[PDB]
Design a binder for this molecule. Structure first.
Ligand SMILES: Cc1ncc(C[n+]2csc(CCOP(=O)(O)OP(=O)(O)O)c2C)c(N)n1
Ligand SMILES: Cc1ncc(C[n+]2csc(CCOP(=O)(O)OP(=O)(O)O)c2C)c(N)n1
Ligand SMILES: [Mg+2]
Ligand SMILES: [Mg+2]
Ligand SMILES: [Mg+2]
Lengths: 527, 527
């Protein structure tokens, strides 16, 4: 307890941390030594995997996740993953070991040069302490910065000789600090907003990932029912904020300016909750909103409020605001929206699987409290239409579009939610980015199901190339990957589905298995 | 070529670039479209692999390598690899596609936020142009910044709508620009240095990676022979700068302060060429130099000159300086140094392989012009003692200690040197970091030999834990990886060696094979 090591672990446990996601190195050994018995360590083989797992775990648990990486090389390997963490507002405490203070100036091997600048601009806060005794206070800042709205990844670099040094005896005041950002709009202005919602003749609601992060899903259901309002999920959705077969639900918005203003045409008040306004992707110029539509955004993120090209904004906690609004608005006497029609069953022969067939089969066979992850980039629209997701925390997709998220994140989610079957639907291209994460699932017996959609190509990129009139583009096809052999390589049970009969058979086997299972599915291909 | 696209490819070809190492994304399609017939594209499945391959290629070819990655996520995935590239002074031109200019402010999906700050502090230059017409001039800056001493990675972010825009007609002046940093110390001061070397009673030479980068190896042989001086390789060596069985050669320096000053005791003048002074790693306090020893460093890098804790320094081109010194110093009439003794042949039974046995066997069987890569971290000393490397460009080791270098870099080196057999000796832990690079070797039929040293553990970390008296450390063992299955997964021929007879058999097969080959070697293990 007298040491920085002892004091830091005490701070961590008192702040509710009990798991370390890591890949170790020399600079981290003085931190990891005498690893306390009330903590667990989750090893992954590459740092993109470490951070991916921790990210899934944080998102599903709705609590900060603690990460330990090796210096610049380890931090650097994780920076694509940190890109995703930024956009999903994932509360990640990223720590990295630094060389001993005496060896920094000469730039010894393993020195993290100008360390705090390395993860910038992706992190909320980034720091290397000026002394050993400062380390617990620096850790306190990291914990709270990650945890306060808008939540996000933070970075702390610690010289390895710091851990053995005497702690400041006054560091005890850090242990039980409670910091809240659970705030909502003042009574007067909240009343004005509620009045505007009550007065709307044709309101619409758009929900984003911070709704699911806040577990505000049920309150948003109540709000939608009271306002009798259609509900969309904001484009490029990292999470699912609403039951997908509720009568109000209208699906995933296309990531385009004109496309969204068209969907919102005729709606006089559009209430956006917990979403950027908006995560557009494709070139689709036009009006941000059509005449007669006003927009009000509730966001936990000042930068989201600042960068919205239209509408009013309120910067507040999504949980507190959704609860306030759901409980304050009048019950409208308008007709409840009609449920969206069932998607068509596509023609399926005895050959390669249409993605539509895969999602239909999953929906038929998976438990109702399944959790899905998506990194099958060309099939996102079909997935959203065909999976009935009733419960919160049921969907995750790389928040910044960074591939290599879903495979490790599915392992972290499954760890956070041992009673809910996790099924990751991942493209053949996407599977390779963080392929080594499979080993963590096998070693810790984390029973994630991985469904590899093998069409031999970067399907989404072919679609983008068509849109952009981009001809003669190299590097779009990925033939000759045996995913069963890869799963075997990392100790994961592997199955193949070349047709529907095999798909049903493989899913049946996977859903009854005691460990992780990979199913390679032969899907229809433009190759 | 009226477009930015046409002008930029013309600049690239006129500057000698003909290969693009990449993993494509949406923002890169307008750059990659109409890919010119005089260029080749080398696809890798993850960006650490892309950069690793390009790095190996650049180091072996002694020319800049051109890289194309996807936005923040792709750049981020490659940042551990950029750490290595920084320390090896690798001339890498890293380009990344950005969102269209119109969609940056709203932060559309695939936007690289504050892009130029992302790869900092790892790169020597980092930039996003303010207009489309500036792109060729920005590319020109990138090419020359990467190429001038001290060589290093650079970063350029380009909004994807820039490529179709009209180029500045004055961009033609960029095409044939020749920029030289091939400089040496002025005559007067060079004369003073030569006189100091001539006057030394007991000189020693220490060489670093910039010697091999400069192909200054032969000049350093001449210098060592003229001075009759023992030659060491500077600690944490990324490259081999000297024939390892030349009588002057004294091997790899231990990465410690006291250890190095002890080796240099009695030497009145120590000439360091092309190395930092020094890449110490382990805690080993003492004198930087013992009384009676003075040090003179020749470095291509101002930061290396600035941060040396001792000695005089000259900042100049390594090729020009080695050539000048080798040709100006008098031939000493001192006795030529005695060659280092043979390493002992360790006892080897019919069971698991001692690393010593592996290197002895490789040295017996590999061609004299083989190129070795090292990422078997616990066996580095044994490797240096047991492999006779006569030629330049014969050795590569992760410059910043960042794992995941050797496997992809071995593919790049083999591409650069099709007539020299590349053999990568990689630990079981290290193999996973960039495992997907194997696919590139299979798809382009790049006949690299991968030797996996499988001891089931992070061996070097166990050693570090003993030095630091770090007990109860989690995450040090990596059981249950089948490397043959992994190689099969990516289409690479796979062999196993459980004993010496099998090792000899597997190496014989690998050396006669037409494609890439992985050999999993069961090595001796502390568990
Ligand atoms: C780290 C990273 N690299 C590259 C990309 C660009 N990218 C976006 S979608 C895609 C295709 C993925 O292919 P696959 O997983 O097979 O799914 P499909 O598109 O075939 O459905 C690529 C390479 C990215 N978003 N992130
Ligand atoms: C990207 C990265 N992650 C982690 C480390 C820390 N590290 C250094 S050596 C090592 C062990 C590598 O094990 P292996 O490849 O099996 O070789 P061995 O030590 O067993 O010879 C690790 C994890 C690093 N240098 N870089
Ligand atoms: Mg695909
Ligand atoms: Mg940075
Ligand atoms: Mg090992």
């Amino acid at each position: 307890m007298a040491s920085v090591h002892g004091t830091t672990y005490e701070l961590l446990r008192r702040q509710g941390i009990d798991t370390v996601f890591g890949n170790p190195g020399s600079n981290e050994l003085p931190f990891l030594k005498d690893f306390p018995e009330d903590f667990r360590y989750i090893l992954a083989l590459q740092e993109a995997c470490v951070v991916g797992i921790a990210d899934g775990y944080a998102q599903a648990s709705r609590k900060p996740a603690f990460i330990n990486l090796h210096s610049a090389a380890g931090t650097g390997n994780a920076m694509g993953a940190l890109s995703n963490a930024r956009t999903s507002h994932s509360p990640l405490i990223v720590t990295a070991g630094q060389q001993t203070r005496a060896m920094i100036g000469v730039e010894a091997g393993e020195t993290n040069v100008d360390a705090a600048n390395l993860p910038r601009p992706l992190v909320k806060w980034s720091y290397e302490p000026a002394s050993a005794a400062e380390v617990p206070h620096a850790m306190s800042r990291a914990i709270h910065m990650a945890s306060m709205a808008p939540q996000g990844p933070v970075y702390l670099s610690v010289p390895y000789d710091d851990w053995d040094k005497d702690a400041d005896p006054q560091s005890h005041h850090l242990f039980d600090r409670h910091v809240s950002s659970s705030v909502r709009l003042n009574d007067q202005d909240l009343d004005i907003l509620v009045k505007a919602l009550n007065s709307a003749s044709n309101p619409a609601i758009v929900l984003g990932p911070d709704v699911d992060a806040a577990n505000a899903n049920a309150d948003c259901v109540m709000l939608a029912e009271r306002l009798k309002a259609p509900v969309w999920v904001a484009p490029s959705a990292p999470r699912c904020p609403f039951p997908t077969r509720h009568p109000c639900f209208r699906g995933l918005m296309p990531a385009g300016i004109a496309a969204i203003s068209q969907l919102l045409e005729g709606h006089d008040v559009v209430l956006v909750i917990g979403a950027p306004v908006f995560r557009y992707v494709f070139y689709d110029p036009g009006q941000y909103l059509k005449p007669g539509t006003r927009l009000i955004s509730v966001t936990c993120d000042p930068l989201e409020a600042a960068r919205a090209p239209m509408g009013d904004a309120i910067v507040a906690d999504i949980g507190a605001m959704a609860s306030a609004l759901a409980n304050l608005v009048e019950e409208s006497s308008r007709q409840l929206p009609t449920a969206a029609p069932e998607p068509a069953k596509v023609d399926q022969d005895a050959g390669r699987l249409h993605p539509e067939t895969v999602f239909d089969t999953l929906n038929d066979m998976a438990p109702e409290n399944a959790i899905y992850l998506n990194e099958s980039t060309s099939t996102t629209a079909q997935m959203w239409q065909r999976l009935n997701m009733r419960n919160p925390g049921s969907y995750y997709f790389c928040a910044a579009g960074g591939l290599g998220f879903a495979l490790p994140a599915a392992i972290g989610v499954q760890l956070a939610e041992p009673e809910r079957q996790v099924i990751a639907v991942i493209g053949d291209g996407s599977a390779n980015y963080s392929i080594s994460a499979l080993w963590t699932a096998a070693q810790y017996n984390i029973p994630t199901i991985f469904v590899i959609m093998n069409n031999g190509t970067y399907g989404m990129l072919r679609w983008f190339a068509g849109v952009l009139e981009a001809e003669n583009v190299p590097g779009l096809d990925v033939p000759g990957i045996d995913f069963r052999a890869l799963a075997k390589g990392y100790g994961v049970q592997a199955l193949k589905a070349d047709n529907l009969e095999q798909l049903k058979g493989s899913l049946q086997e996977a859903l009854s298995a005691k460990g992780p299972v990979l199913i390679e599915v032969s899907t229809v291909s433009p190759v």
